[PDB]
PDB file of N, CA and C in Angstrom:
ATOM      1  N   UNK A   1      10.879  -1.012  -8.014  1.00  0.00           N
ATOM      2  CA  UNK A   1      10.310  -0.163  -6.947  1.00  0.00           C
ATOM      3  C   UNK A   1      10.640  -0.726  -5.574  1.00  0.00           C
ATOM      4  N   UNK A   2      10.561   0.129  -4.566  1.00  0.00           N
ATOM      5  CA  UNK A   2      10.747  -0.278  -3.183  1.00  0.00           C
ATOM      6  C   UNK A   2       9.618  -1.205  -2.749  1.00  0.00           C
ATOM      7  N   UNK A   3       9.981  -2.332  -2.161  1.00  0.00           N
ATOM      8  CA  UNK A   3       9.003  -3.329  -1.771  1.00  0.00           C
ATOM      9  C   UNK A   3       8.426  -3.029  -0.397  1.00  0.00           C
ATOM     10  N   UNK A   4       7.220  -2.488  -0.385  1.00  0.00           N
ATOM     11  CA  UNK A   4       6.504  -2.252   0.853  1.00  0.00           C
ATOM     12  C   UNK A   4       5.882  -3.558   1.330  1.00  0.00           C
ATOM     13  N   UNK A   5       6.455  -4.134   2.374  1.00  0.00           N
ATOM     14  CA  UNK A   5       5.961  -5.392   2.907  1.00  0.00           C
ATOM     15  C   UNK A   5       4.701  -5.175   3.731  1.00  0.00           C
ATOM     16  N   UNK A   6       3.788  -6.130   3.650  1.00  0.00           N
ATOM     17  CA  UNK A   6       2.515  -6.025   4.336  1.00  0.00           C
ATOM     18  C   UNK A   6       2.053  -7.378   4.854  1.00  0.00           C
ATOM     19  N   UNK A   7       1.600  -7.395   6.098  1.00  0.00           N
ATOM     20  CA  UNK A   7       0.924  -8.560   6.623  1.00  0.00           C
ATOM     21  C   UNK A   7      -0.530  -8.565   6.200  1.00  0.00           C
ATOM     22  N   UNK A   8      -1.054  -7.370   5.960  1.00  0.00           N
ATOM     23  CA  UNK A   8      -2.424  -7.217   5.522  1.00  0.00           C
ATOM     24  C   UNK A   8      -2.597  -5.997   4.646  1.00  0.00           C
ATOM     25  N   UNK A   9      -3.807  -5.779   4.149  1.00  0.00           N
ATOM     26  CA  UNK A   9      -4.095  -4.613   3.323  1.00  0.00           C
ATOM     27  C   UNK A   9      -4.107  -3.359   4.187  1.00  0.00           C
ATOM     28  N   UNK A  10      -4.497  -3.529   5.447  1.00  0.00           N
ATOM     29  CA  UNK A  10      -4.513  -2.431   6.407  1.00  0.00           C
ATOM     30  C   UNK A  10      -3.089  -2.014   6.746  1.00  0.00           C
ATOM     31  N   UNK A  11      -2.149  -2.887   6.408  1.00  0.00           N
ATOM     32  CA  UNK A  11      -0.732  -2.646   6.650  1.00  0.00           C
ATOM     33  C   UNK A  11      -0.150  -1.835   5.509  1.00  0.00           C
ATOM     34  N   UNK A  12      -0.983  -1.608   4.511  1.00  0.00           N
ATOM     35  CA  UNK A  12      -0.597  -0.872   3.327  1.00  0.00           C
ATOM     36  C   UNK A  12      -1.166   0.535   3.347  1.00  0.00           C
ATOM     37  N   UNK A  13      -2.157   0.764   4.202  1.00  0.00           N
ATOM     38  CA  UNK A  13      -2.795   2.068   4.277  1.00  0.00           C
ATOM     39  C   UNK A  13      -1.793   3.131   4.688  1.00  0.00           C
ATOM     40  N   UNK A  14      -1.056   2.890   5.768  1.00  0.00           N
ATOM     41  CA  UNK A  14      -0.107   3.879   6.282  1.00  0.00           C
ATOM     42  C   UNK A  14       0.840   4.398   5.184  1.00  0.00           C
ATOM     43  N   UNK A  15       1.634   3.526   4.518  1.00  0.00           N
ATOM     44  CA  UNK A  15       2.549   3.969   3.454  1.00  0.00           C
ATOM     45  C   UNK A  15       1.813   4.572   2.264  1.00  0.00           C
ATOM     46  N   UNK A  16       0.847   3.847   1.718  1.00  0.00           N
ATOM     47  CA  UNK A  16       0.181   4.274   0.494  1.00  0.00           C
ATOM     48  C   UNK A  16      -0.646   5.543   0.712  1.00  0.00           C
ATOM     49  N   UNK A  17      -1.236   5.679   1.898  1.00  0.00           N
ATOM     50  CA  UNK A  17      -1.999   6.875   2.242  1.00  0.00           C
ATOM     51  C   UNK A  17      -1.051   8.053   2.431  1.00  0.00           C
ATOM     52  N   UNK A  18       0.111   7.778   3.012  1.00  0.00           N
ATOM     53  CA  UNK A  18       1.128   8.801   3.233  1.00  0.00           C
ATOM     54  C   UNK A  18       1.748   9.242   1.904  1.00  0.00           C
ATOM     55  N   UNK A  19       1.937   8.279   1.008  1.00  0.00           N
ATOM     56  CA  UNK A  19       2.559   8.534  -0.288  1.00  0.00           C
ATOM     57  C   UNK A  19       1.628   9.290  -1.230  1.00  0.00           C
ATOM     58  N   UNK A  20       0.408   8.792  -1.389  1.00  0.00           N
ATOM     59  CA  UNK A  20      -0.502   9.326  -2.399  1.00  0.00           C
ATOM     60  C   UNK A  20      -1.486  10.334  -1.807  1.00  0.00           C
ATOM     61  N   UNK A  21      -2.014  10.009  -0.634  1.00  0.00           N
ATOM     62  CA  UNK A  21      -3.065  10.809  -0.037  1.00  0.00           C
ATOM     63  C   UNK A  21      -4.268   9.965   0.339  1.00  0.00           C
ATOM     64  N   UNK A  22      -4.359   8.781  -0.253  1.00  0.00           N
ATOM     65  CA  UNK A  22      -5.453   7.861   0.031  1.00  0.00           C
ATOM     66  C   UNK A  22      -4.901   6.468   0.324  1.00  0.00           C
ATOM     67  N   UNK A  23      -5.564   5.710   1.211  1.00  0.00           N
ATOM     68  CA  UNK A  23      -5.070   4.410   1.679  1.00  0.00           C
ATOM     69  C   UNK A  23      -5.349   3.268   0.705  1.00  0.00           C
ATOM     70  N   UNK A  24      -5.960   3.594  -0.433  1.00  0.00           N
ATOM     71  CA  UNK A  24      -6.295   2.599  -1.452  1.00  0.00           C
ATOM     72  C   UNK A  24      -5.056   1.812  -1.864  1.00  0.00           C
ATOM     73  N   UNK A  25      -4.960   0.580  -1.392  1.00  0.00           N
ATOM     74  CA  UNK A  25      -3.835  -0.277  -1.719  1.00  0.00           C
ATOM     75  C   UNK A  25      -4.217  -1.743  -1.627  1.00  0.00           C
ATOM     76  N   UNK A  26      -3.448  -2.578  -2.302  1.00  0.00           N
ATOM     77  CA  UNK A  26      -3.646  -4.015  -2.260  1.00  0.00           C
ATOM     78  C   UNK A  26      -2.384  -4.694  -1.753  1.00  0.00           C
ATOM     79  N   UNK A  27      -2.527  -5.534  -0.744  1.00  0.00           N
ATOM     80  CA  UNK A  27      -1.401  -6.316  -0.252  1.00  0.00           C
ATOM     81  C   UNK A  27      -1.243  -7.561  -1.120  1.00  0.00           C
ATOM     82  N   UNK A  28      -0.668  -7.370  -2.299  1.00  0.00           N
ATOM     83  CA  UNK A  28      -0.536  -8.441  -3.272  1.00  0.00           C
ATOM     84  C   UNK A  28       0.934  -8.802  -3.478  1.00  0.00           C
ATOM     85  N   UNK A  29       1.211 -10.100  -3.591  1.00  0.00           N
ATOM     86  CA  UNK A  29       2.578 -10.601  -3.743  1.00  0.00           C
ATOM     87  C   UNK A  29       3.425 -10.201  -2.542  1.00  0.00           C
ATOM     88  N   UNK A  30       2.756 -10.046  -1.396  1.00  0.00           N
ATOM     89  CA  UNK A  30       3.400  -9.612  -0.160  1.00  0.00           C
ATOM     90  C   UNK A  30       3.995  -8.215  -0.309  1.00  0.00           C
ATOM     91  N   UNK A  31       3.443  -7.439  -1.231  1.00  0.00           N
ATOM     92  CA  UNK A  31       3.881  -6.069  -1.447  1.00  0.00           C
ATOM     93  C   UNK A  31       2.681  -5.143  -1.575  1.00  0.00           C
ATOM     94  N   UNK A  32       2.774  -3.984  -0.957  1.00  0.00           N
ATOM     95  CA  UNK A  32       1.710  -3.001  -1.017  1.00  0.00           C
ATOM     96  C   UNK A  32       1.641  -2.344  -2.384  1.00  0.00           C
ATOM     97  N   UNK A  33       0.554  -2.604  -3.086  1.00  0.00           N
ATOM     98  CA  UNK A  33       0.314  -2.007  -4.383  1.00  0.00           C
ATOM     99  C   UNK A  33      -0.611  -0.813  -4.200  1.00  0.00           C
ATOM    100  N   UNK A  34      -0.008   0.353  -4.058  1.00  0.00           N
ATOM    101  CA  UNK A  34      -0.743   1.567  -3.733  1.00  0.00           C
ATOM    102  C   UNK A  34      -1.395   2.175  -4.968  1.00  0.00           C
ATOM    103  N   UNK A  35      -2.641   2.596  -4.813  1.00  0.00           N
ATOM    104  CA  UNK A  35      -3.343   3.327  -5.856  1.00  0.00           C
ATOM    105  C   UNK A  35      -3.658   4.732  -5.377  1.00  0.00           C
ATOM    106  N   UNK A  36      -4.077   4.821  -4.119  1.00  0.00           N
ATOM    107  CA  UNK A  36      -4.477   6.089  -3.552  1.00  0.00           C
ATOM    108  C   UNK A  36      -5.597   6.724  -4.345  1.00  0.00           C
ATOM    109  N   UNK A  37      -5.553   8.035  -4.478  1.00  0.00           N
ATOM    110  CA  UNK A  37      -6.490   8.728  -5.337  1.00  0.00           C
ATOM    111  C   UNK A  37      -5.731   9.421  -6.448  1.00  0.00           C
ATOM    112  N   UNK A  38      -5.181   8.615  -7.328  1.00  0.00           N
ATOM    113  CA  UNK A  38      -4.418   9.104  -8.453  1.00  0.00           C
ATOM    114  C   UNK A  38      -5.338   9.746  -9.491  1.00  0.00           C
TER     115      UNK A  38
END
């Protein structure tokens, strides 16, 4: 998968919220692990 880099979890909201619809994500392994509202 494409590695969404994040300095923080709030840095994951924009992509993951845009992708899924919800900002639910974890900045883990320096990569945004998006869950959204699946």
